[PDB]
Design a protein around this ligand. Structure first.
Ligand code: HEM
Ligand SMILES: Cc1sc[n+](C)c1C
Length: 291
């Protein structure tokens, strides 16, 4: 399967910076969502789940085709709750009907991270919508109730290595688990709509307790009111993972730098970019624009 990036006709940096600003302006406006967390965390989760279907072996799935717009992927049990990120972006797609679905879903994730004061993420245009029959089947996204060997093995399919996996998981400092979506409940920290390395700090400094929640699932709970998933707590159980966790709890700039590279890589897996294709765009935030 080859997927070649095709820039939307005649579009350039300024067009996409207008779509960025639209998403970012609405993130500021619709602030009440999920008890004032706002839409940013569900939008970086949406960009990860449309990319997370990729399989390196046959180049199926991935962010290129925008296939989450089809019922099979929209109704995947693993995507429960992401309909709220879709409905947030649907106004902006009506306003810029020229951007492809893959591009709009991935740029929403980029925009949310930078607007929640994360690192800049280089983003590239050119994903092309593909037919309903190209939609990957349910079951390619990871279970939460498993251990470190499972996480390592699952992420080899998206060929991410240990460092990349641990840097990507730091995004679980954002938002929260919702019992009616996943059977897990609670936030992982106090700053859950500002991008920081707090996931790593909480994992190493809190007093975790294995408890059972109302959906009868086990999760790690702390006195402070935070929770960690079994696959999250996995990172301090494995010796290779645990020493990268310590590296990111001791250096927030290295965390930001490595997250930026692994999230772009995540969003680009499966796409062939021609050598005459434009460079990756670095978008300015509303704040750097005085907007
Ligand atoms: C083995 C890996 C992973 C598993 C099992 C997993 C699982 C989960 C689960 C069960 C939730 C709760 C959903 C809900 O109830 O609403 C969640 C939320 C979230 N995850 Fe993951 N995740 C994984 C990796 C990642 C990665 C790599 C990213 C992003 C780079 C990510 C970003 C998020 C975000 C931002 C949320 C919060 C959503 C919200 O607030 O609504 N996840 N995760
Ligand atoms: C959202 C998610 S998923 C796992 N944790 C810890 C949070 C905060």
């Amino acid at each position: 399967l080859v997927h070649v990036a095709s820039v939307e006709k005649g579009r350039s940096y300024e067009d996409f910076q207008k779509v960025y600003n639209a998403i970012a302006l609405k993130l500021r406006e619709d602030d009440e969502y999920d008890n004032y967390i706002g839409y940013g965390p569900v939008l970086v989760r949406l960009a990860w789940h449309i990319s997370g279907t990729w399989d390196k072996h046959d180049n199926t799935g991935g962010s290129y085709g925008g296939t989450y717009r089809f019922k099979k992927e929209f109704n995947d049990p693993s995507n429960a709750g992401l309909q709220n990120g879709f409905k947030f972006l649907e106004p902006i797609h009506k306003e810029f009907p020229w951007i492809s679905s893959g591009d709009l879903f991935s740029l929403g994730g980029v925009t949310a991270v930078q607007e929640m004061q994360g690192p800049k993420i280089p983003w590239r245009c050119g994903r092309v919508d593909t037919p309903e029959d190209t939609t990957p089947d349910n079951g390619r996204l990871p279970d939460a109730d498993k251990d470190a060997g499972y996480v390592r093995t699952f992420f080899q399919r998206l060929n991410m290595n240990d460092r990349e996996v641990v840097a990507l998981m730091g995004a679980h400092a954002l938002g929260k688990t919702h019992l009616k979506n996943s059977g897990y409940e609670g936030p992982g920290g106090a700053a859950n709509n500002v991008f920081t390395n707090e996931f790593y700090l909480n994992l190493l400094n809190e007093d975790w307790k294995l408890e059972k929640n109302d959906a009868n699932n086990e999760q790690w709970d702390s006195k402070s009111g935070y929770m960690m998933l079994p696959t999250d707590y996995s990172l301090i159980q494995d010796p290779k993972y645990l020493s990268i966790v310590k590296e990111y709890a001791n250096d927030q700039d290295k965390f930001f730098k490595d997250f930026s590279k692994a999230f772009e890589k995540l969003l680009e897996d499966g796409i062939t970019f021609p050598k005459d294709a434009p460079s990756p765009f670095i978008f300015k935030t509303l704040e750097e624009q005085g907007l």
